């Protein structure tokens, strides 16, 4: 009877991997970085793109897993590994190395998490300049109707950096951080047709045309 599970809140409020990247133990410049967009993954992108304008808070879950890489030493002992995830809002200083001053995060929020514990989680508010997030943008970045065309003239959400706080281990360890978004308290407007053609690029709608549906033999075929 009830249409409860088909509410927008239930539809979108499930964690989804939006991106995942890797970094190395000592390395040299073994830090990772990610400009935050929601269009690199197909599943979440389609769910969000069923609507033109959205508004919601976010639940961020990080799943960080490491693995031993080959080494030449005798019996390398792994001490527990701690990681730092720093958020650099647009305009802030950017880490250029694993031992940069930016990592001090006096103002920039960041998480310190030790392996073997519950995955770290953070909620974040509605961070938009406008009165709603924009899923599509039929315009340009420059008033001369030139420069960039699409939603990447709007996307400016800052960067996300990843590093080992532990370091110098006698044997190398490679880590993989997986970012997960879960929209909370969602508000959607102007529904639009589901995506039909496979996604091609994260920064534009560009598609390769495909057929409307699967095919059958005859109109009376069953």
């Amino acid at each position: 009877h009830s249409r409860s599970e088909s509410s927008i809140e239930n539809f979108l409020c499930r964690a989804a991997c939006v991106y995942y990247a890797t970094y190395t133990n000592n390395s040299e410049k073994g830090y990772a970085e990610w400009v935050i967009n929601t269009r690199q993954v197909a599943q979440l992108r389609r769910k969000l793109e069923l609507f033109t304008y959205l508004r919601f808070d976010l639940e961020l879950t990080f799943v960080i897993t490491s693995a031993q890489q080959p080494s030449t030493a005798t019996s390398v002992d792994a001490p527990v590994q701690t990681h730092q995830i720093m958020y650099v809002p647009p305009g802030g200083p950017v880490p250029t190395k694993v031992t940069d001053y930016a990592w001090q995060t006096s103002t920039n929020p960041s998480v310190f998490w030790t392996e073997g514990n519950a995955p770290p989680r953070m909620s974040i508010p509605f961070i938009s300049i406008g009165n709603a997030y924009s899923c599509f943008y039929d315009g340009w970045t420059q008033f001369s109707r030139n420069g960039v065309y699409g939603i990447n003239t709007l996307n400016n959400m800052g960067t996300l950096y990843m590093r080992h706080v532990n370091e110098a281990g006698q044997g190398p360890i490679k880590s993989t951080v997986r970012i997960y978004f879960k929209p909370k308290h969602v508000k959607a407007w102007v529904p639009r047709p589901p995506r039909l053609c496979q996604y091609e690029k994260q920064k534009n709608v560009n598609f390769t045309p495909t057929g409307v549906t699967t095919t059958r033999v005859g109109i009376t075929t069953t």
Binding site: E9, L58, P125
Partner: peptide
């Protein structure tokens, strides 16, 4: 029974009901 522990509304659970 649902009590909110955080000072910021964004920290709350989903509006499931």
């Amino acid at each position: 029974t649902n009590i909110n522990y955080y000072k910021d509304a964004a920290s709350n659970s989903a509006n499931r009901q």
